[PDB]
Design an enzyme around this catalytic site. Structure first.
Site, PDB file in Angstrom:
ATOM      1  N   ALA A  67      -6.546  -3.193   7.025  1.00 44.48           N
ATOM      2  CA  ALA A  67      -7.721  -2.622   6.372  1.00 44.48           C
ATOM      3  C   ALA A  67      -8.800  -2.306   7.379  1.00 44.48           C
ATOM      4  O   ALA A  67      -9.058  -1.139   7.674  1.00 44.48           O
ATOM      5  CB  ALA A  67      -8.260  -3.569   5.343  1.00 44.48           C
ATOM      6  N   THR A  83       0.834  -1.228   0.000  1.00 47.28           N
ATOM      7  CA  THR A  83       0.000   0.000   0.000  1.00 47.28           C
ATOM      8  C   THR A  83       0.846   1.245   0.000  1.00 47.28           C
ATOM      9  O   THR A  83       1.865   1.302   0.679  1.00 47.28           O
ATOM     10  CB  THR A  83      -0.884   0.072   1.253  1.00 47.28           C
ATOM     11  OG1 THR A  83      -1.853  -0.979   1.229  1.00 47.28           O
ATOM     12  CG2 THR A  83      -1.618   1.409   1.318  1.00 47.28           C
TER      13      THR A  83
HETATM   14  C1  LIG Z   1      -1.711  -1.545   2.665  1.00 44.27           C
HETATM   15  C2  LIG Z   1      -0.543  -2.570   2.734  1.00 44.27           C
HETATM   16  C3  LIG Z   1       0.293  -2.388   3.988  1.00 44.27           C
HETATM   17  O1  LIG Z   1       0.415  -1.231   4.413  1.00 44.27           O
HETATM   18  N1  LIG Z   1       0.916  -3.398   4.680  1.00 44.27           N
HETATM   19  C4  LIG Z   1       0.894  -4.808   4.339  1.00 44.27           C
HETATM   20  C5  LIG Z   1       0.066  -5.632   5.351  1.00 44.27           C
HETATM   21  C6  LIG Z   1      -1.305  -6.118   4.791  1.00 44.27           C
HETATM   22  C7  LIG Z   1      -2.466  -5.476   5.554  1.00 44.27           C
HETATM   23  C8  LIG Z   1      -3.819  -5.278   4.788  1.00 44.27           C
HETATM   24  N2  LIG Z   1      -4.372  -6.551   4.466  1.00 44.27           N
HETATM   25  C9  LIG Z   1      -5.568  -6.843   5.066  1.00 44.27           C
HETATM   26  O2  LIG Z   1      -6.133  -6.112   5.831  1.00 44.27           O
HETATM   27  C10 LIG Z   1      -6.175  -8.148   4.716  1.00 44.27           C
HETATM   28  N3  LIG Z   1      -6.799  -8.820   5.911  1.00 44.27           N
HETATM   29  C11 LIG Z   1      -6.165  -9.142   7.087  1.00 44.27           C
HETATM   30  O3  LIG Z   1      -4.970  -8.880   7.265  1.00 44.27           O
HETATM   31  N4  LIG Z   1      -6.889  -9.777   8.102  1.00 44.27           N
HETATM   32  C12 LIG Z   1      -6.238 -10.148   9.379  1.00 44.27           C
HETATM   33  C13 LIG Z   1      -6.413 -11.660   9.527  1.00 44.27           C
HETATM   34  O4  LIG Z   1      -7.364 -12.261   9.004  1.00 44.27           O
HETATM   35  O5  LIG Z   1      -5.462 -12.310  10.237  1.00 44.27           O
HETATM   36  C14 LIG Z   1      -6.827  -9.396  10.650  1.00 44.27           C
HETATM   37  C15 LIG Z   1      -6.120  -9.812  12.000  1.00 44.27           C
HETATM   38  C16 LIG Z   1      -6.670  -7.865  10.471  1.00 44.27           C
HETATM   39  C17 LIG Z   1      -7.204  -7.941   3.539  1.00 44.27           C
HETATM   40  C18 LIG Z   1      -7.718  -9.337   3.109  1.00 44.27           C
HETATM   41  C19 LIG Z   1      -8.429  -7.059   3.991  1.00 44.27           C
HETATM   42  C20 LIG Z   1      -3.660  -4.441   3.516  1.00 44.27           C
HETATM   43  O6  LIG Z   1      -3.960  -4.937   2.424  1.00 44.27           O
HETATM   44  N5  LIG Z   1      -3.219  -3.162   3.660  1.00 44.27           N
HETATM   45  C21 LIG Z   1      -3.069  -2.254   2.540  1.00 44.27           C
HETATM   46  C22 LIG Z   1      -4.299  -1.225   2.495  1.00 44.27           C
HETATM   47  C23 LIG Z   1      -4.679  -0.619   3.899  1.00 44.27           C
HETATM   48  C24 LIG Z   1      -5.609  -1.897   1.920  1.00 44.27           C
END
Ligand SMILES: */C1=C\C(=O)NCCCC[C@H](NC(=O)[C@@H](NC(=O)N[C@H](C(=O)O)C(C)C)C(C)C)C(=O)N[C@H]1C(C)C
EC number: 3.4.25.1
Lengths: 244, 233, 250, 212, 241, 244, 242, 198
Positions: free
Chosen positions: D49, D1
């Site tokens: 997210a 992101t």
């Molecule tokens: C920006 C990317 C970033 O800044 N960092 C990379 C980390 C990825 C985080 C985020 N992805 C998501 O939120 C996922 N879902 C989950 O991580 N779910 C977790 C789980 O099931 O263990 C719970 C504990 C939060 C997607 C499938 C919604 C991401 O894509 N960050 C992006 C931007 C904010 C959309």
């Protein structure tokens, strides 16, 4: 002075608790109900006044069971009656859970007794507007009990409370005299139906509905059950016959 | 006399009466008439909605508690909301936990015990509302009459509210007739509208004035108002 | 249930009086007399054991009580109130002092403690003041001997000698006459017995009288030996026999 | 992101990508990383997210309530502290959000606040947040001037996200532009990185490495 | 534990405890506030049932809730402390969370709320106090003057007074203050206040204290002399006729 | 319920007065008189011991003058028991202030806290106020010598000279008649005793019926000192001031 | 004394009833609903000429589509308004949609009976009922424009027009005749402005009277003085016209 | 860590604090002012954990200002520091402790003397002629231990700092982006806006 009857925990100058006494009024004013301790169980019967043809017959059941072996019937403020039984149920459940054995009639008695007496201790509560006849079979026989709003209770051979309480007590005493050797569960059901029919004269204005229930070691295996169908009609008859 | 024994529900009068409770029961009589009656296949509620001005709406008298249970109120609206809402939870809990529809008979036992609690503890006040609960469960159709005293009773039919005695006598008379109105909701309903008009006086039941509800065998508790009731006036 | 009495039961009247405290004091007046005398080497406190039936055994009941091994108390008023006050005073001595400093509280403070307890029963919600007045006598290293009187109001004051209860006015007058700042303990004991006789109707002996003292250390009353700094309690209740002996020299 | 917001003469520029992942798995290329708190407040979304999206929506509700109460548009600095403080109440709990609160109040003018689940709250002219921030910074830092035409600033932003989307594996999908003026923010479309890249390559002659 | 409803409705729809609270205000010393064109002034009288006090230490009648806002009152003093505290604490809390000092209107709305709450909460009696809150919103120059009462109600005034004989001085003001042309000067503004107090103070140079508030946290309380002077120049206005 | 016995100690009178605060004050009007006079170089506290006896152990007694801090003390008028309860919390408050700031609690600050505690029993709780009024005599480096007074209401004010308890009106007049801003401790010491002397409900003003205290800055030091005269010290100063 | 939640022998709650009285003493407030919007009007009633009449707020915004007018002890209205605003905003946060005007009203009404000294049903902490009634006006897509009357009783009605406050009984009587299913917004404005002039002790002007409305297009707005004045002038002329 | 320096000269206390705010790989800001004014003559510099840092500083500020208003008086620097120590000392044994270190410099208007207090998140308080939190201490204490004099003018003090800042830039790993300097004295607190080349 006076006013010793406006608060529940107050002792009048002669040592009474008018509130409790006023409660008894609400009771005597209620329907009549009895308990007959036969030689291996107890029989319960109650007067169910038919306020109108609108009351679905056989529906508004009064006698309540606590656990599986105890029976409760009361005269007075029905809602208070139920409230008490609920407590008895929790009380019995708590007991069984720790000691395994289903609560002994005596122990249960004092369980309800202490609870009721508890409501004559504070001015923040109202005493129970009911007298309760209850009992069942346990490790050592059958037991019949009656509990007053004051919290007082004793074991009876026969017991009655409510409007027709006297006619009943009258009849119950007759039985006790003409049966030193004991009455059978079967017989107590009949005698009860009669005694209810007689006690109904102090209310001969409204028509009623009889309701009997028993707990007999030989008849119901120590379990409390409602007398229905044939055995019931049979008693209604034995009574209807002797009322003439 | 009475003045010294009605300052709260935790006081008995020298005669064994609980005035505060009786005063509550009064609020019901001051309430708009409502009728309940049932056959073996259906249960019905008919209620007279009362309005303030002619610029105001008519207040709802019937409330649904589940797909198989509902009731009509007479008295303090708020209290009906509280009690019905509580009766909704109980039906709800019966499902969620036992996957079982809360039998009407039990719903009653529940209401009774809830009410009773507000008549033996300091600070509490009785509920100033009467209720007529109808419902179809595993043992058929049912009608219940709830009194703030805690007394809940199962009847074939009945009424409560001002002039209710009119309808009640009418039902008490029509008994053997409506109780056999099975397989026909419209008939059971008309018998219900008749019973209620027996308690009229002021005016005559109109379209935005009459309120009807019905539950039954294959009929989920459904309320009818306005145009919907037109075919009964 | 639930004590809904969360408001004071002792309030100010338009005159500025606190009814219940006044009435409580009245209750004290009605109670059996008891007195206290401070000598240059001890203190004595005594009262009358008003046996409330010849069948009752007055020994199984002490109006004179040990609070700490160097502090004793005696009352006038409602026996039962005193009783619980003693237990409380014994505990408070531990909880708020011996457990913190490893030494028993000095008279003034323990008294101060009891006072507070009573003071609270004068303002807390749903309660009545204590129907008793106390005469506490004790000794501590940095204060010597002392005598205090505690009232249901929660007030307390030091005395060279004094009495409370029934014939207090009479006895108080008799003490002002016999007290001096040179009395030895035995002297006070004598004066005590005399001052007491006046308020006594019937029998006056070691079985009807109850008196204790706060004098020298009784190592013989310690229960164990081997520790130099532990010399024994200064508090000692006289025996019936000890009382009668003195009554002959009356 | 990758999310970036910078202040300049024409106000504030805000651009973000739209890729969402779960490890190496691209969950979505159609996520809205900009939350329109209200006609004058924007919130960027980087980190978890749900954590951003949920709490920023909640922020909107607090801002609305504040205006109903005070009959006046809430300030950027205040809005940013609400999130800041809420987030700090959960410090150590696991929330994960790096966000930008951008607004334009007559009182403060163009304003940008950086707020992360760490409790860090910072005011500044330029902020790049996200797994692609450095890439965006690279482009942005070397072409920023307070004197950019609202048109050039818009481009520089769009281009800064284009860079990050390219190099960063976790960024991509499409670009979403916003221009913050006192009258509020003005959306400036969604530009698919897919087609945007090529176009830029050809027209600009950069990305000379890639073959096309 | 204690929750007795002390403030309840009576047949005629009144809440006597709140009403009596007001009576406590009527008995309190008089307090007045008049807003000029670039300032607000608050004046308060000093009782005289006993005189031998140490005015240095004795708590004054005008309090500072924050640097740009002050609050004066009429009623029970003990009660005023509790209100002034809550106000001061909220003043800081608002800065801390909103990063901006409270507006005079806001600080007022808060105090009023506290009071209102005390009129419908169990176990408590309303505040026997009525307040005058004045100052300047942050980075603003239009003076502010509000008043609150036990009922929990409040509103703004061009000038107002509370306390004993407030009836009198209000009249004085109602026929001596023109909204068209408000005291365009700090001096002529303080004069109008001293004048208004004199109507009830009955010669009390040492019985009248004045506090002037200007924009940007410029708060100051005049000394006996500065005040004595105003009284002086005023008494002549009468005689010179 | 319980409402039947609730005095509602915290309500307003139709005149907007606080019954109990009023009555509490009424009580205090009968308490030994306490006077506080403040001179340029020190403060004086003099009080009259209510009820005394030949037997009362006077050396070990204290019923009106209490030390709160090293630079603060109070004179009481009303329920001693009540006073103490407040005095102890006062003593603690001082210490906490010291523990938090490593500086001695400013006189007014201590006085405000105490008054606030009282004020509370006045607005909520359903309990009776404290039947006490205090004359605070203290010194700090911000306002130097200070003299304050607080009562059941919870309000407090400062004074040059003041009194509490019985015959206050009489005393106030006498003080207001002979006080001068340029007084000296000694002067104040005399004026104090003279006033009591003229207001005493008793025969003569003897030492055994008094409690005295002075807060002076012993020049040969530079620090302030609290002196709570002993029986003999009062007996002396009493002969000196010409009251033998 | 007697419990704050005690019943009268006639079946009513004393405190609630007495509560209604304090309201009759309150400032007049009138509401008229039209298929073009709902109009809310109130009597400022300044207790002195020095009181800055515009600091009098008796018509407030709950949401952009829901506003209300109050009568009686207005200090009591604050906690209710706060509750109403929160409920409306929250519903939006939980359901991504505006709250129905009826539910908003029903929500407020639920606080009403939450009082006593120990009422067995939950934790009703509030010593007495509210001493104020409310006219809630608004619009939603389910029942269009709506006008609601919420009393401390805990009940609420929906009126085409309703007037509460000191001049009510008479004003309401007026509305009984004046109101009709085809009124225009403009018409309802003058009508409110008229009935206000009748029951007000004071000579109605744009400084002791305030109008406002709610329209699907622009939501809840409070007419600024200038706008109200002209409407007043307009009223006078049409009145003197016959 | 960040750079928190403090040096008390003859008539004032000078506080220097790094302007860098780095989060992981990127330096987010280069103009951060790691200071809060507690009162007209008391300034507090701080460094530590991300959130705790300001949260604690502002909190302390609020409380100090409230005391100012309530007492219409300004607490001595000594007092202010005692309050601060207490707070941290409480914090250390709490559920989640404030991880902040601070320097408190103020001018005691009563004693008419400048003061410098050093306090760490443990509630360790010490008063020093000069002090610093974090690593800076390791390079600067020897400098000051060498070139420090109690009667130094405010200007001498600044030069002495200039000396410390240089050493810090020379031998330290991190780019702290320079420091913001502030002086506390009889006339209050002011910031030397020209130190980026003084
Ligand atoms: C920006 C990317 C970033 O800044 N960092 C990379 C980390 C990825 C985080 C985020 N992805 C998501 O939120 C996922 N879902 C989950 O991580 N779910 C977790 C789980 O099931 O263990 C719970 C504990 C939060 C997607 C499938 C919604 C991401 O894509 N960050 C992006 C931007 C904010 C959309």
């Amino acid at each position: 002075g006076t006013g010793y009857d406006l608060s529940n925990s107050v002792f009048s100058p002669d040592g009474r608790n008018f509130q409790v006494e006023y409660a008894v009024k609400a009771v005597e004013n209620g329907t009549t109900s009895i308990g007959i301790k036969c030689n291996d169980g107890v029989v319960f019967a109650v007067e169910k006044l038919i306020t109108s043809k609108l009351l679905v017959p056989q529906k508004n059941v009064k006698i309540q069971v606590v656990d599986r072996h105890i029976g409760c019937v009361y005269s007075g403020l029905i809602p208070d009656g139920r409230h008490l039984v609920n407590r008895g149920r929790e009380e019995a459940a708590s007991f069984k859970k720790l000691y395994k054995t289903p609560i002994p009639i005596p122990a249960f008695a004092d369980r309800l007794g202490q609870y009721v007496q508890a409501h004559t201790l504070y001015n923040s509560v109202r005493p129970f507007g009911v007298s309760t006849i209850f009992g069942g079979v346990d490790k050592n026989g059958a037991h019949l009990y009656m509990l007053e709003p004051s919290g007082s209770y004793w074991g009876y051979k026969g017991a009655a409370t409510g409007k027709g309480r006297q006619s009943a007590k009258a009849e119950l005493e007759k039985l006790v005299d003409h049966h030193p050797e004991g009455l059978s569960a079967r017989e107590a059901v009949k005698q009860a139906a009669k005694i209810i029919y007689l006690a109904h004269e102090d209310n001969k204005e409204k028509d009623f509905e009889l309701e009997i229930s028993w707990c007999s070691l030989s008849e119901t295996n120590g379990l409390h059950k409602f007398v229905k169908g044939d055995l019931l009609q049979e008693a209604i008859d034995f009574a209807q016959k002797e009322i003439n | 006399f009475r003045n010294n024994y009605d300052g709260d529900t935790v006081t008995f009068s020298p005669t064994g009466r609980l005035f505060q409770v009786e005063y509550a029961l009064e609020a019901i009589k001051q309430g708009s008439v409502t009728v309940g009656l049932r056959s073996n296949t259906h249960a019905v509620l008919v209620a007279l909605k009362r309005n303030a001005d002619e610029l105001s709406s008519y207040q709802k008298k019937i409330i649904k508690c589940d797909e198989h249970m509902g009731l009509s109120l007479a008295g303090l609206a708020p209290d009906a909301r509280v009690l019905s809402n509580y009766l909704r939870q109980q039906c709800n809990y019966s499902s969620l936990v036992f996957n079982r529809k809360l039998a009407v008979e039990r719903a009653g036992h529940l209401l009774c015990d809830k009410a009773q609690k507000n008549t033996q503890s300091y600070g509490g006040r009785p509920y100033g509302v009467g209720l007529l609960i109808i419902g179809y469960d595993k043992s058929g159709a049912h009608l219940l009459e709830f009194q703030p005293s805690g007394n809940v009773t199962e009847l074939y039919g009945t009424a409560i509210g001002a002039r209710s005695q009119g309808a009640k006598t009418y039902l008490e008379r029509t008994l053997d007739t409506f109780i056999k109105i099975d397989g026909n909701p419209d008939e059971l309903i008309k018998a219900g509208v008749e019973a209620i008009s027996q308690s009229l006086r002021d005016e005559s039941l109109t379209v935005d004035n009459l309120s009807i509800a019905i539950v039954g065998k294959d009929t989920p508790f459904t309320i009818y108002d306005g145009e919907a009731v037109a075919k009964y006036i | 249930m639930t004590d809904r009495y969360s408001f004071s039961l002792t309030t100010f009247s338009p005159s500025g009086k606190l009814g219940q405290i006044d009435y409580a004091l009245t209750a004290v007046k009605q109670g059996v007399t008891s007195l206290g005398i401070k000598a240059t080497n001890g203190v004595v406190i005594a009262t009358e054991k008003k046996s409330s039936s010849p069948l009752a055994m007055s020994e199984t009941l002490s109006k004179v009580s040990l609070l700490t091994p160097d502090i004793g108390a005696v009352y006038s008023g409602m026996g039962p109130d005193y009783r619980v006050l003693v237990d409380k005073s014994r505990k408070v001595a531990h909880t708020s002092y011996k457990r913190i400093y490893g030494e028993y509280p000095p008279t003034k403070l323990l008294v101060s403690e009891v006072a507070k307890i009573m003071q609270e029963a004068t303002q807390s919600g749903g309660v009545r003041p204590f129907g008793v007045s106390l005469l506490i006598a004790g000794h501590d290293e940095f204060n010597g001997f002392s005598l205090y009187q505690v009232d249901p109001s929660g007030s307390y004051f030091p005395w060279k000698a004094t009495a409370i209860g029934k014939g207090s006015v009479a006895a108080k007058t008799f003490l002002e006459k016999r007290w001096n700042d040179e009395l030895e303990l035995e002297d006070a004991i004598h004066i005590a017995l005399l001052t007491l006789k006046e308020s006594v109707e019937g029998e006056f002996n070691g079985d009807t009288i109850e008196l204790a003292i706060i004098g020298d250390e009784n190592p013989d009353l310690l229960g164990y030996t081997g520790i130099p700094t532990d010399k024994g309690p200064r508090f000692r209740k006289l025996t019936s026999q000890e009382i009668n002996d003195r009554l002959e020299a009356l | 992101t990758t999310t970036l917001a910078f202040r300049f003469q024409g106000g504030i520029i805000v651009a973000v990508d739209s890729r969402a992942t779960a490890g190496n798995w691209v969950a979505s290329q159609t996520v809205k990383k900009v939350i329109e708190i209200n006609p004058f407040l924007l919130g960027t979304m980087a980190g978890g997210a749900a954590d951003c999206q949920f709490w920023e929506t909640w922020l909107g509700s607090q801002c609305r309530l504040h205006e109903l109460r005070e009959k006046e548009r809430i300030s950027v600095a205040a809005a940013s502290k609400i999130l800041s403080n809420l987030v700090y109440q959960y410090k150590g709990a696991g929330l994960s959000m790096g966000t930008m609160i951008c607004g334009y109040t007559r009182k403060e003018g163009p304003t940008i606040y950086y707020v992360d689940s760490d409790g860090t709250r910072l005011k500044g002219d330029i902020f790049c947040v996200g797994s692609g921030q450095t890439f965006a910074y690279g482009v942005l830092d070397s072409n920023y001037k307070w004197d950019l035409s609202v048109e050039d600033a818009l481009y520089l932003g769009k281009r800064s996200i284009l860079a990050a989307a390219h190099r960063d594996a976790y960024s991509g999908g499409s670009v979403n532009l916003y221009h913050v003026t006192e009258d509020g923010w003005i959306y400036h479309g969604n530009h698919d990185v897919g087609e945007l890249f090529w176009k830029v390559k050809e027209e600009e002659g950069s990305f000379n490495n890639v073959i096309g | 534990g204690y929750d007795r409803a002390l403030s309840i409705f009576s047949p005629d729809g009144h809440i006597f405890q709140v009403e009596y609270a007001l009576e406590a205000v009527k008995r309190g010393t008089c307090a007045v506030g008049v807003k000029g064109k670039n300032c607000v002034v608050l004046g308060c009288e000093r009782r005289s049932t006993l005189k031998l006090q140490d005015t240095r230490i004795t708590p004054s009648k005008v309090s500072k809730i924050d640097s740009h806002v002050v609050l004066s009152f009429s009623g029970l003093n003990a009660d005023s402390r509790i209100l002034i505290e809550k106000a001061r604490v909220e003043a800081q809390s608002h800065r801390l969370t909103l990063e901006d000092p409270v507006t005079v209107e806001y600080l007022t709305r808060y105090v009023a709320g506290v009071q209102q709450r005390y009129t419908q909460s169990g176990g408590v009696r309303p505040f026997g106090v009525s307040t005058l809150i004045a100052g300047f919103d942050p980075r603003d120059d239009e003076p502010k003057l509000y008043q609150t009462e036990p009922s929990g109600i409040y509103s703004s005034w061009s000038a107002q007074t509370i306390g004993r004989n407030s009836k009198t001085v209000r009249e004085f003001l109602e026929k001596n203050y023109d909204r068209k042309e408000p005291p365009a000067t700090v001096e002529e503004c303080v004069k109008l206040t001293v004048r208004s107090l004199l109507e009830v103070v009955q010669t009390g140079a040492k019985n009248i204290e004045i506090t002037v508030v200007k924009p940007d946290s410029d708060i100051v309380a005049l000394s006996s002399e500065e005040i004595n002077q105003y009284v002086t120049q005023i008494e002549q206005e009468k005689q010179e006729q | 319920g319980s409402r039947r016995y609730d005095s509602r100690t915290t309500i307003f009178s139709p005149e907007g007065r606080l019954y109990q605060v009023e009555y509490a004050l009424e009580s205090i009007s009968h308490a030994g008189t306490a006077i506080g006079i403040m001179a340029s170089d020190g403060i004086v506290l003099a009080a009259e011991r209510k009820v005394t006896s030949t037997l009362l152990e006077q050396d070990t007694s204290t019923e009106k003058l209490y030390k709160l801090n090293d630079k603060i003390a109070v004179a009481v008028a009303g329920l001693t028991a009540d006073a103490e309860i407040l005095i102890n919390t006062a003593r603690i408050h001082a210490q906490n202030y010291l523990k938090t700031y490593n500086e001695d609690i400013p006189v007014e600050i201590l006085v405000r806290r105490l008054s606030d505690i009282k004020q509370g029993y006045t607005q909520h709780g359903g309990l009776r106020p404290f039947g006490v009024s205090f004359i605070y005599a203290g010194y700090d480096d911000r306002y130097g010598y200070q003299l304050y007074t607080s009562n059941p209401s919870g309000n407090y004010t400062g004074w040059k000279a003041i009194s509490v308890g019985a015959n206050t009106s009489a005393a106030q007049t006498l003080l207001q008649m002979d006080y001068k801003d340029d007084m000296k401790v000694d002067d104040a010491i005399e004026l104090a005793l003279k006033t009591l002397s003229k207001t005493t409900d008793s025969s003569a003003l003897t030492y055994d019926r008094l409690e005295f205290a002075t807060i002076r800055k012993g020049a040969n030091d530079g620090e302030v000192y609290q002196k709570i005269f002993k029986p003999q010290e009062i007996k002396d100063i009493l002969v000196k001031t010409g009251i033998t | 004394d007697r419990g704050v939640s005690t019943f009268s022998p006639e079946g009513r709650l004393f405190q609630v009833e007495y509560s209604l009285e304090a309201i009759k003493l309150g400032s007049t407030a009138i509401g008229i609903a039209t298929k073009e919007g709902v109009v809310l009007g109130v009597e400022k009633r300044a207790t002195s000429p020095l009181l800055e009449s515009d600091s009098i707020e008796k018509i407030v915004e709950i949401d952009r589509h829901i506003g209300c007018a109050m009568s009686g002890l207005t200090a009591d209205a604050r906690s209710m308004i706060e509750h109403a605003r929160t409920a409306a905003v929250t519903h939006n946060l939980y359901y991504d949609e505006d709250i129905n005007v009826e539910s908003l009203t029903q929500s407020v009404c639920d606080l009403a009976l939450r009082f006593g000294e120990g009422a067995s049903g939950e934790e009703r902490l509030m010593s007495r009922p509210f001493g104020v009634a409310l006219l809630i006006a608004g619009h939603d897509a389910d029942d269009g424009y709506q006008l609601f009357h919420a009393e401390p009783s805990g009940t609420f009605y929906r009126y085409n027009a309703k007037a509460i406050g000191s001049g009510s009984e008479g004003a309401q009587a007026e509305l009984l005749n004046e109101w009709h299913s085809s009124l225009t917004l403009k018409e309802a404005e003058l009508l409110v402005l008229k009935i206000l002039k009748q029951v007000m002790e004071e000579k109605l002007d744009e400084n002791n009277a305030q109008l406002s409305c709610i329209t699907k297009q622009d939501g809840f707005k409070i007419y600024d003085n200038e706008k109200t004045a002209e409407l007043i002038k307009e009223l006078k002329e049409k009145e003197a016209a016959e | 860590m960040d750079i928190i320096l403090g040096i008390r000269v003859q008539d004032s206390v000078i506080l220097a604090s790094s302007k860098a705010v780095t989060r992981g790989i990127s330096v987010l800001k280069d103009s951060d002012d790691k200071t809060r004014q507690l009162s007209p003559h008391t300034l507090m510099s701080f460094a530590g954990e991300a959130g705790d840092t300001v949260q604690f500083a502002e909190y302390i500020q609020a409380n100090i200002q409230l005391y100012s208003i309530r007492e219409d008086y300004e607490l001595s620097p000594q007092a202010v520091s005692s309050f601060v120590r207490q707070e941290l000392a409480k914090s250390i044994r709490s559920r989640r402790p404030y991880q902040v270190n601070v320097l408190i410099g103020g001018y005691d208007k009563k004693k008419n003397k400048p003061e410098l207090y050093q306090i760490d998140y443990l509630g360790t308080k010490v008063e020093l002629p000069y002090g610093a939190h974090g690593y800076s201490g390791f390079y600067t204490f020897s400098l000051l231990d060498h070139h420090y004099r109690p009667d130094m003018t405010t200007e001498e003090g600044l030069d002495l700092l200039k000396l410390c800042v240089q050493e810090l830039e020379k031998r330290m790993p991190m780019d702290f982006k320079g420091v913001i300097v502030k002086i506390v004295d009889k006339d209050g607190i002011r910031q030397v806006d020209d130190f980026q080349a003084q």
